[PDB]
Amino acid sequence: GAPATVTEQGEDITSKKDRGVLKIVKRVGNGEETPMIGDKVYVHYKGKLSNGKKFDSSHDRNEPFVFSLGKGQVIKAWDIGVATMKKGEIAHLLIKPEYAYGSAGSLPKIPSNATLFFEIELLDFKGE
Ligand SMILES: C=C[C@H]1CN(Cc2ccccn2)C(=O)[C@@H]2CCC[C@H]1N2[S@](=N)(=O)c1cc(Cl)cc(Cl)c1
């Protein structure tokens, strides 16, 4: 399925090239510009654990998730990954725990040492 495919066919987007965050572009977005640090980013997403459970979805809430890029309001992989996306892009990310919730996990949804899968759509980015 999609998690296996990004695991086996994704590209390393980390600065360290430690394969901690792999990406596949599913739908090419608009032009060349990606958001900058401090932008208010609006995304839709779905997240799955390695046991197949969908642990979250903005679609299911009928509202986008909004955060300020690059300010550590989200897991490291999101700040890294969303920063690579164009407006309108849909991407898959496969994230090792060192770029997500590590040995702690995040109670109750995320276990310790969890590799995470996301599908993310960048809706809009604005501001700083
Ligand atoms: C809508 C909540 C976000 C939570 N965070 C930041 C955060 C804030 C507080 C505690 C744990 N993580 C995040 O960094 C990431 C990435 C952006 C979407 C989503 N999460 S998430 N991984 O989907 C998620 C989803 C759910 Cl239902 C619970 C948790 Cl603990 C984490």
- Which residue's CA lies nearest to atom 3 of ligand 1? 74
* Total number of domains constituting the chain: 1
Separation of CA 18 and ligand 1 centre (Å): 23
Please identify which residue in the block is written with the tokens 């401090």. Answer: 38
**Which experimental technique did the depositors report for determining this structure?**
X-ray
Amino acid at 32: E
Q: For the chain, give the number of residues.
A: 128
For residue 98, the enclosing domain spans: 1-128
What whole-number distance in Å separates Cα of residue 27 and Cα of residue 121?
9
Residues 46/116, Cβ–Cβ less than 8 Å: no
What whole-number distance in Å separates Cα of residue 117 and Cα of residue 91?
11
Residue 8 DSSP one-character state: H
Entry resolution in angstroms? 1.0
Residues 71/37, Cβ–Cβ less than 8 Å: yes
